[PDB]
From Swiss-Prot:
<feature type="binding site">
    <location>
        <begin position="82"/>
        <end position="84"/>
    </location>
    <ligand>
        <name>GTP</name>
    </ligand>
</feature>
<comment type="subunit">
    <text>Interacts with RASA1. Interacts with the general transcription factor GTF2I, the interaction sequesters GTF2I in the cytoplasm.</text>
</comment>
<feature type="region of interest" description="Has GTPase activity, required for proper localization">
    <location>
        <begin position="9"/>
        <end position="232"/>
    </location>
</feature>
<comment type="function">
    <text>Rho GTPase-activating protein (GAP). Binds several acidic phospholipids which inhibits the Rho GAP activity to promote the Rac GAP activity. This binding is inhibited by phosphorylation by PRKCA. Involved in cell differentiation as well as cell adhesion and migration, plays an important role in retinal tissue morphogenesis, neural tube fusion, midline fusion of the cerebral hemispheres and mammary gland branching morphogenesis. Transduces signals from p21-ras to the nucleus, acting via the ras GTPase-activating protein (GAP).</text>
</comment>
<feature type="binding site">
    <location>
        <begin position="212"/>
        <end position="214"/>
    </location>
    <ligand>
        <name>GTP</name>
    </ligand>
</feature>
<feature type="binding site">
    <location>
        <begin position="184"/>
        <end position="186"/>
    </location>
    <ligand>
        <name>GTP</name>
    </ligand>
</feature>
<feature type="binding site">
    <location>
        <position position="48"/>
    </location>
    <ligand>
        <name>GTP</name>
    </ligand>
</feature>
<feature type="binding site">
    <location>
        <begin position="29"/>
        <end position="33"/>
    </location>
    <ligand>
        <name>GTP</name>
    </ligand>
</feature>
<feature type="binding site">
    <location>
        <position position="24"/>
    </location>
    <ligand>
        <name>GTP</name>
    </ligand>
</feature>
<protein>
    <recommendedName>
        <fullName>Rho GTPase-activating protein 35</fullName>
    </recommendedName>
</protein>
<feature type="binding site">
    <location>
        <position position="52"/>
    </location>
    <ligand>
        <name>GTP</name>
    </ligand>
</feature>
């Protein structure tokens, strides 16, 4: 409720350039690794490799649950979702392509009902979910409180930033708090970092947190920064 000092639970959606392997140059922008390091930061539980190329069976399992988002779990309360795009492992087109909103619209969704969705660990889990802990997304539904807007600044960047700008506009229409997160800063390019900062400075009170999921720098800070903004 709006009158409370701390709302106590925070549903955070992590978004950024997403699509086919080709649209990502066979290299995603860092959403999954950011989420993974936040929710389960131990070396034993952190995976650098989280493919979004899935079989129809993987896509229809209870972890993916016919969604283009993943429930990464609960941090203790913060519930973490990654908005992405899953492609078929034979046709290489998005799962349910004809039925889908474009990513920018999909990713800006603030009501995320996926009943009996299980928490995601890794693509190994998929269709083998009995082999992992089975934690369900709360209430089968999340009302998004805020967004982390990811930008890969590591060494086609200008097209990424164009996409980020269009995605930002969709997010801003929600009137939900947004924090820009620069990802893979352990390999960061100063020109890219500078351009990302210029973009965020063009907006009203848009903070930028510089992160590395790989080196485990500023991951908690990115999320805490958003939680603080949510409660303002
Ligand atoms: N150097 C470096 N590489 C990283 C970092 N985070 C992720 N990566 C690399 O970038 C790859 C893609 O990261 P990933 O988190 O899966 O991206 P994504 O945005 O989830 N991709 P998708 O759009 O497919 O869901 C990883 O497999 C890893 O090689 C980081 O902090 N530093
Ligand atoms: Mg991912
Ligand atoms: Mg409040």
């Amino acid at each position: 409720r709006e009158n409370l000092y701390f709302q106590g639970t925070y549903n955070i959606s992590v978004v950024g350039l997403s699509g086919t392997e080709k649209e990502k140059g066979q290299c995603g922008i860092g959403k999954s690794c950011l989420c993974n390091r936040f929710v389960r930061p131990s070396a034993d539980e952190f995976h650098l490799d989280h493919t979004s190329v899935l079989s129809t069976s993987d896509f229809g399992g209870r972890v993916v649950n016919n969604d283009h988002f993943l429930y990464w779990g609960e941090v203790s309360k913060m519930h973490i979702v990654e908005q992405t795009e899953f492609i078929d492992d034979q046709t290489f087109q998005p799962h349910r392509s004809t039925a889908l909103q474009p990513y920018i619209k999909r990713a800006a969704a603030t009501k995320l009902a996926s009943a009996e969705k299980l928490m995601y660990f890794c693509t190994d889990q998929l269709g083998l979910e009995q082999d992992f802990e089975q934690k369900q997304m709360p209430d089968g539904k999340l009302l998004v409180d805020g967004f982390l807007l990811g930008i890969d600044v590591s060494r086609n960047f200008d097209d990424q930033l164009k996409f980020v700008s269009n995605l930002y506009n969709q997010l801003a229409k929600t009137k939900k708090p947004i924090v820009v997160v620069l990802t893979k800063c352990d390999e960061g390019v100063e020109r890219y970092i500078r351009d990302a900062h210029t973009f965020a400075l063009s907006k009203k009170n848009l903070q930028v947190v510089e992160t590395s999921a790989r080196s485990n720098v500023n991951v908690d800070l990115a999320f805490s920064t958003l939680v603080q903004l949510i409660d303002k």
